[PDB]
Design a protein around this ligand. Structure first.
Ligand code: LWA
Length: 152
């Protein structure tokens, strides 16, 4: 059958919202009121992959855009990028591994681990208006926990 998808927003555990501000540039900042329209709406697809009660493989596309978060090596490091795809062919149930995140539920928060790069996570900085990135530890000063808001 098709792939199943939900519209949603994400906020980091310091309640920073995610926005587009540059061509392929997703950023995290404190947002409230009128400016909350600026936040990115995701289409979260439930994709093929290894699954358990609290670890669910997803892809994160931008709503009604042929753009997906992906994990690739850049200048020899696991990095987060926005990648364009053929809009005729996406989303699909069997997403390529660079597109797959394990959505992990721990203590009423979510983490998004790269399926491609184990123990690398979607991360934000504590500072305002810095890139969303792939961080190689769910420890330290960087933020690896999120909440999801379901959107119409
Ligand atoms: N110097 C640049 O032209 C440039 C800098 C940063 C970005 N993107 C990111 O850092 C991505 C955004 C999705 C996750 O991380 C894109 C372009």
């Amino acid at each position: 059958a098709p792939v199943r998808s939900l519209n949603c927003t994400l906020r980091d555990s310091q309640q920073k919202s995610l926005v587009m501000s540059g061509p392929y540039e997703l950023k995290a900042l404190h947002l409230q009121g009128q400016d909350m329209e600026q936040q990115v709406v995701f289409s979260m697809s439930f994709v093929q992959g290894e699954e358990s009660n609290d670890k669910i493989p997803v892809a994160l596309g931008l709503k009604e855009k042929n753009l997906y978060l992906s994990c690739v090596l850049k200048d020899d490091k696991p990095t987060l990028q926005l990648e364009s795809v053929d809009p005729k062919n996406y989303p699909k149930k069997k997403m390529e591994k660079r597109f797959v995140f394990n959505k992990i539920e721990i203590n009423n928060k979510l983490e998004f681990e790269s399926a491609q790069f184990p123990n690398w996570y979607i991360s934000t900085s504590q500072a305002e208006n810095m890139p969303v990135f792939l961080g190689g530890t769910k420890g330290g000063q960087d933020i690896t926990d999120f909440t999801m808001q379901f959107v119409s």
